[PDB]
Design a protein around this ligand. Sequence first.
Ligand SMILES: *[C@@H]1O[C@H](CO)[C@@H](O)[C@H](O)[C@H]1NC(C)=O
Ligand SMILES: *[C@@H]1O[C@H](CO)[C@@H](O)[C@H](O)[C@H]1NC(C)=O
Ligand SMILES: *[C@@H]1O[C@H](CO)[C@@H](O)[C@H](O)[C@H]1NC(C)=O
Ligand SMILES: *[C@@H]1O[C@H](CO)[C@@H](O)[C@H](O)[C@H]1NC(C)=O
Ligand SMILES: *[C@@H]1O[C@H](CO)[C@@H](O)[C@H](O)[C@H]1NC(C)=O
Lengths: 102, 438, 438
Amino acid sequence: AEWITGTTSRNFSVGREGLEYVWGNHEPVRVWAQESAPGDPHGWPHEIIIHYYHRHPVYTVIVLCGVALAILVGTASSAACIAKARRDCLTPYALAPNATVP
Amino acid sequence: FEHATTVPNVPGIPYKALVERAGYAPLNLEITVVSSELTPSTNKEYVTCKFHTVIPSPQVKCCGSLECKASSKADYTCRVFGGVYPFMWGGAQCFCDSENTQLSEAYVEFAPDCTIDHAVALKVHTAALKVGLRIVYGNTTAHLDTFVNGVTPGSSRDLKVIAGPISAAFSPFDHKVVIRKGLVYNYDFPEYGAMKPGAFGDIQASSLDATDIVARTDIRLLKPSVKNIHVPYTQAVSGYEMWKNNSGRPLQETAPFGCKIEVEPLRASNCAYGHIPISIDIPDAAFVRSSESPTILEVSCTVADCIYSADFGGSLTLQYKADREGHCPVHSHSTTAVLKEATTHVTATGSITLHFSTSSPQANFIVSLCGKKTTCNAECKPPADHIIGEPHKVDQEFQAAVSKTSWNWLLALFGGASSLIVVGLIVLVCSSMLINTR
Amino acid sequence: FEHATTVPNVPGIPYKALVERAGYAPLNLEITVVSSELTPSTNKEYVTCKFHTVIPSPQVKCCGSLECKASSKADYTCRVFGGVYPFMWGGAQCFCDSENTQLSEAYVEFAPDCTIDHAVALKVHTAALKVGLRIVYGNTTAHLDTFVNGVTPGSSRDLKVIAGPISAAFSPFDHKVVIRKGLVYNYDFPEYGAMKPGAFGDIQASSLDATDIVARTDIRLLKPSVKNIHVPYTQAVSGYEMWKNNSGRPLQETAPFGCKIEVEPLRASNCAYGHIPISIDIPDAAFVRSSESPTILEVSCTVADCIYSADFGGSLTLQYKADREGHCPVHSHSTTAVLKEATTHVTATGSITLHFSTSSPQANFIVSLCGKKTTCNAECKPPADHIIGEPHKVDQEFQAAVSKTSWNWLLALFGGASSLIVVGLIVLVCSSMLINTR
Ligand SMILES: *[C@@H]1O[C@H](CO)[C@@H](O)[C@H](O)[C@H]1NC(C)=O
Ligand SMILES: *[C@@H]1O[C@H](CO)[C@@H](O)[C@H](O)[C@H]1NC(C)=O
Ligand SMILES: *[C@@H]1O[C@H](CO)[C@@H](O)[C@H](O)[C@H]1NC(C)=O
Ligand SMILES: *[C@@H]1O[C@H](CO)[C@@H](O)[C@H](O)[C@H]1NC(C)=O
Ligand SMILES: *[C@@H]1O[C@H](CO)[C@@H](O)[C@H](O)[C@H]1NC(C)=O
């Protein structure tokens, strides 16, 4: 609630639930914010990133964090498995130096 | 036919559904909450206002003494002074030099203007939601005033509606409320007979005309040190006025869920907070058999210019061929997209346009026309208008708010990670069989 | 002086205690619950009784038609019959051979004698217990009528009492009750508007004089096939009479905890279920200092012919050698023994006699006179009378109801078992010593 004199602008945050403002003796005015974020959900991936960042910031941060963690763990574990199998194929041939590898 | 579903508590926003009895044609059914009524049970404690602090004429007895008995007047205060010498217009008032007793007298009462400017203290309890329901089924309408308690039917006889218990209890009023001139405040007032001077509720009575008025305003009768007849008094400021200083703002401008407070039964009107389970016993006269309903030989939906917003943004046209001309229920079988129209008119062949509101970037949903199932697929653009003056008809869902392109990207990355897992374990198994050979 | 204790809810049965200030003489104090009133908050749903099922005069129209509109009368049923030819005393009643019509009309109203024989359906909530108390302290008496919620105070002259919340909430009334002619029944009646024919609640109204009456009796109008002018109707029987068949027994003769159900505010009187914590603001004028309190050099009790019955069975004599003659409180500090007299007259040296009631087979308890403590022990025989017309003044305790010789036997066997266990551990220690020695 604010008592206002003069010509000054006020910023109010509107969500999906809504916002009702009464100005003077006028009837209450109800507004609802639509999900009109900049970007494009159907396009290149970056536009999707800006769109869902402006809509739900923490949600898209944790989703991309999960994606980055998943790809990092997947590549690291696959590389570890390939390295272990490559060692398991090599060291039978490494203990015998004069042996001819196929 | 007993049909059970769940409607939102939002005023307006028609909730549409089909009742599909097996042997009969699908029947449209939409329920609209026209109004809501949180009416708590209120117990009246007292009425307060500005006191009058009326002081009667000073009673003097000279060459004598006085004492007063207890009185039922509000905030009784006697005091005896034994050295006065009153001087009205025309010299001294009686005939003794020094020993002169004056009874200073003070008590409070309601002001003459408390019939309007008064505050009523109320204690509330759990509130019962009463909702007005506009239910249309087939071509018939019904207006009901149901209770949300979960057992009481609606006041319409023929259509039996049980509005189940609402998911969350809201109760915008705290346990103690104060009503002044149509404005409602959540104030923790003092209890009856538990007054405090200078705060709200200095003076208390069960009614304006009641004679059982109680008060403990801190009044102190000072000693008259002037020639002229006087009752000097020091009193606390009116706590009703002090509350009018710091009343804050009423619940008409503070209450959650955007609902307005009225004072004649003290009800909260149009609170959009929870979900109401509802069960309707539709009479069998509304249902018609599948023979009399037209059947759709072929249906296909093509949707153009869809946009996910509160308004019905998006036009899907059904191209259809049907044998018999008639009327047909039309429905959207997704909780994300809702159609504007419930019934259409079907000819032998043609196309009907329909408007829907969705909350998903993709318009992949099932639309039904005289039963039937057609699937609609499109990419829906984000809205250009930032803010709209009408609420959203549908609620967001996690599986729908994520677009199909984004779903393909995340599933491609996750499937790539999983494929690296699978090839790692496969080559590990190959190493295992090689070390079994060794 | 804020003294807090706990009283049983049994009507009668005085509970005695000592308030023992450090610098003052011991003060006796007993509470008696004279009456209790457990009043729930009742919400009235509807009233019901028999129905009159009045039928208006048939309306005929010959060479015409009669369609009938809806009516606000309870359970309105209208039928149109288009092949009638009615007869009265005088012959044919109209001028068309076959093109006639009759409007059979039937609705439901209250019977004339429903001002007495009617049932009120009530929905009750949690019940607030209000207790009347006879308190005595020192040598003065006082009466109280206070609530049990633990917030509001009971005031009597210079006594402020807070009766704390009771240990268990009983509420003998179910959520739905029915009152008929002063008899209360725990019946799950149908809700307002949920009329079922042939059941309690065929007819419903807000009051007996209300014009907004609702009814769903299974009334059907048949086609007249007789010469006489006649409305053939067939109706389900009154569910009020059916409930009078199967009313069972009322709550006056079924409610637990032995307390009486009354109907004018719908309260439950003299319910003895749970212990009440109580806090008492004792005025300082009741106490006396220890200088005026006659102490005793040596107290010595002895019990003779003790018996543990509900009556005050068993007498004990204090022999005392006090220093002054006066009045003095006496007390039994155990919760098993309770004394009849809370006061006695003390002399220089003598012997007073007192009566006590116990629940334990042993007379082991501590008795106090002007302060002081003494414990005297003898044997209490079981009573010979099987029942008695008065409730027990105390409650059994497991530590007390087991007799002293039975504690001796049980502890003898348990100590024998423990002694053999101790012997086993001793010889195990000796074996450990030997295996350390080797
Ligand atoms: C209000 O919002 C506008 C939107 O662009 C912004 O530019 C402006 O700085 C804001 N004003 C204040 C006072 O925060
Ligand atoms: C409902 O009534 C309208 C009136 O025009 C009619 O067209 C329609 O067919 C009716 N509905 C059904 C299911 O018969
Ligand atoms: C009354 O209330 C107002 C509102 O806060 C406060 O600022 C003011 O000091 C108070 N007193 C007077 C005399 O206006
Ligand atoms: C209390 O008052 C009664 C009433 O006569 C009297 O008999 C008794 O002696 C009084 N008690 C004391 C301790 O004075
Ligand atoms: C009425 O109630 C009684 C009590 O159970 C029942 O036995 C009887 O059959 C009923 N009917 C009549 C006509 O008495």
